[PDB]
Amino acid sequence: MNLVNKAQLQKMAYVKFRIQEDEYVAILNALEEYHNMSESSVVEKYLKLKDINNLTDNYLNTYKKSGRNKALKKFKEYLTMEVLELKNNSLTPVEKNLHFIWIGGQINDTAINYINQWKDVNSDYTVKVFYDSNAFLINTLKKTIVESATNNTLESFRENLNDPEFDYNKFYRKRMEIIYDKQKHFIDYYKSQIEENPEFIIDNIIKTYLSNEYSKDLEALNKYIEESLNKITANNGNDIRNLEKFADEDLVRLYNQELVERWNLAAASDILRISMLKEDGGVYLDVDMLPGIQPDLFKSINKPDSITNTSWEMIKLEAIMKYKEYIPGYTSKNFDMLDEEVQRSFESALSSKSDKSEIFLPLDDIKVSPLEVKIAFANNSVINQALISLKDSYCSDLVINQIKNRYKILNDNLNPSINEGTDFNTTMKIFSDKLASISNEDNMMFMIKITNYLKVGFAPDVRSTINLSGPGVYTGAYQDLLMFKDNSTNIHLLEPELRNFEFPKTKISQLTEQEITSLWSFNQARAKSQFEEYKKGYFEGA
Ligand SMILES: O=c1ccn([C@@H]2O[C@H](COP(=O)(O)OP(=O)(O)O[C@H]3O[C@H](CO)[C@@H](O)[C@H](O)[C@H]3O)[C@@H](O)[C@H]2O)c(=O)[nH]1
Ligand SMILES: [Mn+2]
Numbered sequence: 001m002n003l004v005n006k007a008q009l010q011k012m013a014y015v016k017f018r019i020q021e022d023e024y025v026a027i028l029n030a031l032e033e034y035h036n037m038s039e040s041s042v043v044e045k046y047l048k049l050k051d052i053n054n055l056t057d058n059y060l061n062t063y064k065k066s067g068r069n070k071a072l073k074k075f076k077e078y079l080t081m082e083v084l085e086l087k088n089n090s091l092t093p094v095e096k097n098l099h100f101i102w103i104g105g106q107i108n109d110t111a112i113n114y115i116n117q118w119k120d121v122n123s124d125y126t127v128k129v130f131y132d133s134n135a136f137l138i139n140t141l142k143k144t145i146v147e148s149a150t151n152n153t154l155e156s157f158r159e160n161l162n163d164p165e166f167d168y169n170k171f172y173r174k175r176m177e178i179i180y181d182k183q184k185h186f187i188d189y190y191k192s193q194i195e196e197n198p199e200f201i202i203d204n205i206i207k208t209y210l211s212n213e214y215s216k217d218l219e220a221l222n223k224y225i226e227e228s229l230n231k232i233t234a235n236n237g238n239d240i241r242n243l244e245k246f247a248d249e250d251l252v253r254l255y256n257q258e259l260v261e262r263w264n265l266a267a268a269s270d271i272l273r274i275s276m277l278k279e280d281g282g283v284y285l286d287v288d289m290l291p292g293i294q295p296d297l298f299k300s301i302n303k304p305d306s307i308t309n310t311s312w313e314m315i316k317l318e319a320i321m322k323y324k325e326y327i328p329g330y331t332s333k334n335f336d337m338l339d340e341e342v343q344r345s346f347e348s349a350l351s352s353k354s355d356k357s358e359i360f361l362p363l364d365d366i367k368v369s370p371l372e373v374k375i376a377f378a379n380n381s382v383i384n385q386a387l388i389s390l391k392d393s394y395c396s397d398l399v400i401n402q403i404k405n406r407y408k409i410l411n412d413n414l415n416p417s418i419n420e421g422t423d424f425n426t427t428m429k430i431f432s433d434k435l436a437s438i439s440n441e442d443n444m445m446f447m448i449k450i451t452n453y454l455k456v457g458f459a460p461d462v463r464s465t466i467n468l469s470g471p472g473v474y475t476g477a478y479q480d481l482l483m484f485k486d487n488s489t490n491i492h493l494l495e496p497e498l499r500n501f502e503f504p505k506t507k508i509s510q511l512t513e514q515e516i517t518s519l520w521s522f523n524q525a526r527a528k529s530q531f532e533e534y535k536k537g538y539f540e541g542a
């Protein structure tokens with residue numbers, strides 16, 4: 001897995017009596033100077049490989065029938081290997097910052113209690129919980145608009161309840177058409193106000209809108225902000241509106257897009273986390289992630305063979321929150337399925353244990369490369385609920401560029417679709433066709449997955465965020481890194497190649513209670529589940 005020499009590569013690509021072409025010589029020279037660079041920075045060493053990989057397929061593009069090509073395709077694979085080598089030999093401990101994000105509303109006690117677990121166990125880490133002091137009223141506003149649409153949709157249902165295909169499917173379809181119109185009425189309002197006075201604060205536009213159009217009480221809203229700001233200050237609150245240099249004005253624009261217009265706090269958070277990791281360095285976590293459990297704790301307790309590796313890891317946590325009681329309310333439903341003598345095997349190991357540090361594994365020194373961003377896995381796929389990156393890392397720029405490039409395709413096609421259409425149905429048809437007209441082999445999948453963007457948060461199985469700002473943008477970045485590209489969208493990296501970038505697994509417990517629920521999306525089950533409730537709030541009332 002060592003990178004071949006000039007002379008060694010020459011053996012590989014040797015064709016008897018063939019002229020040494022300029023494009024070939026160029027490759028060999030450049031490979032020579034890479035091996036005479038060993039003092040340089042990792043990033044600089046990566047960039048030299050990237051030029052070497054560009055000179056190589058220039059050769060291949062030039063001589064498509066050259067008897068050198070086979071060997072040179074293999075060379076390209078060794079370049080890929082060399083990246084992993086540079087990565088694996090450039091590890092260094094991350095900045096000891098620990099990031100969380102809660103925006104668009106008041107932080108709940110459930111999040112703070114999960115966060116506090118991290119704080120207690122990591123003295124040497126600066127816990128920062130980013131919030132947006134200008135935007136406490138996003139969730140409120142969406143809750144009101146969604147509310148109004150639900151109701152209107154249900155009034156056009158008051159004599160069709162029992163059948164036929166007025167099921168939960170038709171409810172969302174038709175609710176969405178109303179949500180879109182109402183949402184657009186607000187956006188148009190917000191946008192005209194910002195033209196008026198650019199200094200205007202998001203929440204101030206929001207309250208004026210809520211009081212004028214939906215009869216909300218000004219005072220109640222100002223007290224909600226005041227409380228929300230109070231709570232988060234009390235809890236290591238870092239206001240983003242206080243920071244100066246961080247702002248990538250492009251990212252800020254898209255951060256604002258997801259926060260104010262789309263009301264996707266998860267998307268907004270996807271955007272803010274990578275920006276903060278880049279500027280600050282460290283470890284990012286979702287507020288529903290708990291720390292890793294100490295290896296040796298339950299090592300002497302053998303997993304009952306009829307029980308999954310997953311449920312056991314899940315029990316391991318519930319066992320902690322039964323006896324030690326760090327989080328009040330934490331489920332033990334799975335723990336109670338166990339045999340008495342095994343339940344007492346857990347009481348036994350949790351007996352002679354003093355500090356929370358002997359229970360949860362502290363993060364300590366986490367080693368990472370400048371060339372990478374480490375990421376959590378769930379079900380043999382990356383998931384960005386947990387990230388690690390050095391300040392100003394190369395791969396963070398790749399991630400940020402993936403986001404921008406994807407939003408450029410989105411916005412360039414969506415914005416005019418918004419302007420040309422006269423309702424939800426027409427906008428979606430214009431958007432769908434515009435993406436069709438510019439779709440090809442290398443982006444078709446991406447186009448399909450972002451087609452339903454305007455539906456995010458309002459309808460079941462809507463997953464566009466994943467491929468704009470979430471996991472997809474990381475696997476995209478990893479393909480950029482390994483394959484030497486800047487445009488990766490058609491993914492060909494398999495799990496074991498993606499596993500190079502994994503969050504160290506012993507240093508996180510992903511399988512918590514709060515993770516079971518999602519706040520930006522929902523599946524078909526929950527959709528049906530709460531169609532019943534909304535409907536059942538029409539016979540049951542005051
Ligand atoms: O009102 C909200 C709601 C969510 N969030 C943020 O959203 C993040 C994740 O929310 P979660 O409820 O866990 O949604 P998931 O269904 O788990 O979202 C998945 O998909 C998203 C990718 O778009 C990622 O943000 C998440 O890491 C990933 O777990 C949280 O940590 C918060 O930072 C807010 O700030 N305010
Ligand atoms: Mn009063």
Ligand SMILES: [Mn+2]
Pocket residue numbers: 279280
């Ligand atoms: Mn810093």
Ligand SMILES: [Mn+2]
Pocket residue numbers: 286288385514515517518
């Ligand atoms: Mn989650």
